[model samples]
Target: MSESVAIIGAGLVGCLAALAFSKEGYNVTLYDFRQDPRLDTLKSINLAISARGIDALKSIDPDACEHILQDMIPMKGRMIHDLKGRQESQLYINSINRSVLNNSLLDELEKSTTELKFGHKLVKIEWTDDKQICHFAITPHTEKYDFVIGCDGAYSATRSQMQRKVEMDFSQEYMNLRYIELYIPPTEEFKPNYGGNFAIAPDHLHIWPRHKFMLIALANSDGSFTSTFFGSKDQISDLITSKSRVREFLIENFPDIINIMDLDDAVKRFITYPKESLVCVNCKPYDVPGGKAILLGDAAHAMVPFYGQGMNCGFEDVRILMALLKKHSGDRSRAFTEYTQTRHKDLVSITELAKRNYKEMSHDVTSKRFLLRK
Candidate 1:
């Protein structure tokens, strides 16, 4: 049977996700409110789809993946930037303009079943029986759907709406780092190369520590992941102030992404993405009286993306609740209650965990002293 879904925030991840989904039998409606020239703030980001990322595409449509692949810069081995005691290697990008890529992705999407809408922003998400009611900031009316995939950024407006609906846990880690949010919800007939969802264990959380910070993603459904990051507010603030710094940062991490993201535009979004101060957030009772209206705070311990209120408080195997959160929902109280009380300790752990990771990311990645130690 064909299915319907609403994909939010067509910035960086949303576009890719929509593209991936449309490849299937999905009727995709893509929404992005980033109109004011800061359009697709994270659009400049390019992909380093090596390892699993590449495999995902090849498995999907080898022909399309071949086209996408030809454009990618050929990446070489380690000792990059003169690594391993000043050895030299490199990873360049497609040499394509940032806007060119954005338009291209958009163009390709337009040719598909995906419908793109700009100017509309997600304000509220309500349920009417089995249908999803998505309200936007620019409009008063609500659009109904079979499901909604939130690809909004770390500063996602759709996430904001869920904040109002459920109790999300919240916490903030250290500094000197930056992060991008990625969400992968469940789908049947799971594709292998649709961004590497099938390879990783769906239930286990995964982490890959780069020098400065780490990119982590938790399991939602079998093979489905929801990824977020922790980093320095001060560092990103300072780095974002200059496009060069942001560019340098990305390159330092993996300039291979140069094709995927424009260092220039990438920095601009970092500066403008609204630097919200981090705080810890962990509240229970993830839903209202019943599951009819489920809230997703982003993470189990929501990490208070705001000054304090995390977006946390969302639990119940966000996947199950997600299923029950079911485009709609069912019920829950105690499972989430203890989630707050007993699980609160683990919730608190994210902060200390964040702290431990701070210097590791900020200094380790760039520090010659540490690298030598390694």
Candidate 2:
């Protein structure tokens, strides 16, 4: 019989893990704490998919990779705007709406044997020497599996459980800045002289750079752009303390964005939207001793979304782990051991680099300092 695996956190990495395992003939049941993203409203920030992430997708299933990212916009450069009215364009993000990519994965998984269980939160994991019992918060019952694959993200319950049983090392840090999402609509006047509904070049990632706080936008297929603002608690709190302050800040820092966006609505969303803190997670020995459980993606190494391949490296994790599995011919204990030994250095160094670059995403820099390389 194929080994049965319980995969947690049906986000970017979890979904891909399910498909890869199933493709390799494993019985995979993917679980998430939330409702099915395809069937519900998933409000989120659209992120750029770097080459590492894209290559990982293609390595698993080339056709599905293309299909999954069909509607994503290819950002050519970062349009960095600073004080005065100047702009510098260079390389950074080529983004896709995560909601769109997720739906595509779910659609693919549905055609195969992978079962997606939504609304099933992992409350606790009880394990014997030979099997794992996963308990769900939505239910009192538990289910047994041969092994567990945790892609449950930075604050992983699976990681917590594993730490209890294994001798592990971990570290974490949070950015002083908080993030909030806002929107910029397509230009209302689509002139005959111009091509698309975009207020600016849809092919570029727009940035309003301030050393301590920053604003960014990525175009979507709907002609709208998803914008993200990053600032510290005190800064954001003081600004959002009143509606007028929000407008004043936008006018001063990102006047161009305000011209395209409904300033009234933007101010309202800024005040009402959640103030989210960004966290960085770094860990070592990403697997259980017996290969009964293992961590991948954010569960293993959640880095700051600044100078690293947060999604790309995540997909790379799947690619690397699956290759190790094949290399060991399904001897998971050996394969997982080797994975930790070989992969630990890169994961550690990368997070360290990105952690140092919390400013890279939260500040202004010369366009020459960035690149879109392999």
Candidate 3:
């Protein structure tokens, strides 16, 4: 009989894990607390498929990867706009829709043998020597599996559960930074030079960097851009208190954006949009002893998005774990043990890199010293 595995969270990493394990002949069942995201109309930040992500996806299933990647818009560089409205182009990567990519992954899963149990929030887990029992919020709550893989996001319930069984070292710190989503409507005219109805260049990640806070925009297929404003909690809170302050702040720091973005809508969004806090999660020994469970993706090491490597890092986690599994000839105990020992160092550094890059993106990118070094 094939071993049954319970994978928690049906997001990007989770969906990919289901596909990978199913291909390896495991009876994989994926669970998520939330309802199907494809049915939701909520907004999402723009996500770029870094090379690491592409490689990981291709390694799992080349055809599925090619299919999913078809929607990506190639971004060749970053168009940095200074306070004086000066524009500078720096090399960058491709941008893709987060929700779209996730939905496509789910679509692929539908054709697979993996069972996707939506709205099944995992409440608890009973780990034994040979078998793992998972308890969820939904009916038929308890299910047993040979092993459990957790791909839950930053606040992963799976990670918390594993802490009880294993002496796992963990720490999560919320940064002072906060981000709010914004939008830039496309131009009324379809500009042939840019290949679409884009108001600005679509082949670049647009950054309006101000030392303390910054504004960023990424191109969408619809000729518009999805933008984000990042700043300290105190700064955003102060600005949001008055529409005039928000307007003044934008006009002063990101002068160029005034022409592209609707100031009234931008002001409303700045005051009304949810201010999301950034967090960094780090842990050691991501797997339970005896191969009963393991953690992957943001569930294991959640980093700030300054480096834009969160998804890629998670995908790499999948790639590395799969390789280890193959290398050990499907020996869970040995493969999982080695995964924790080797993976921690890289994960730790990337978290640090992500934190440091926030400063680089917000401040250093405009400095001649930094640009000269580059």
Highest TM-score, which number?
Answer: 3
Model 1 segments beyond 4 Å from truth? 36-47, 80-85, 88-101, 163-167, 172-374
For every candidate in turn, the CA RMSD to the true structure comes to 12.6, 4.4, 3.2
User: What residue runs in model 2 are displaced by over 4 Å at the alpha carbon?
Assistant: 40-43, 91-93, 191-195, 307-309, 359-374
Give one digit per residue, the lDDT tens place, for model 1 in 1-374: 66677878664345555676577666889887767333445322233233334454344445665565554443332222222223233222112223434555576677788988888878888855576788887747578876666656445455455556665544344423345554444544566554333333332334434555544434432444444444566655667677777667656654333442345655555666754444333344333332232223342343533112221222122323323222332223333343334444654565566555454543357555323232
TM-score for each model: 0.49, 0.90, 0.94
- lDDT, model 3: 0.85
Q: Which ten residues in a row have the lowest lDDT in candidate 1?
A: 306-315
How many Å off is the CA of 149 in candidate 3? 0.6
Worst 10 residues of 2 by lDDT: 365-374
- 247-320, model 3: which lDDT tens digit per residue? 98787777788888999998998888774757888888899988888999999988876565777888889899
Overall lDDT per candidate, in order of appearance: 0.48, 0.81, 0.85
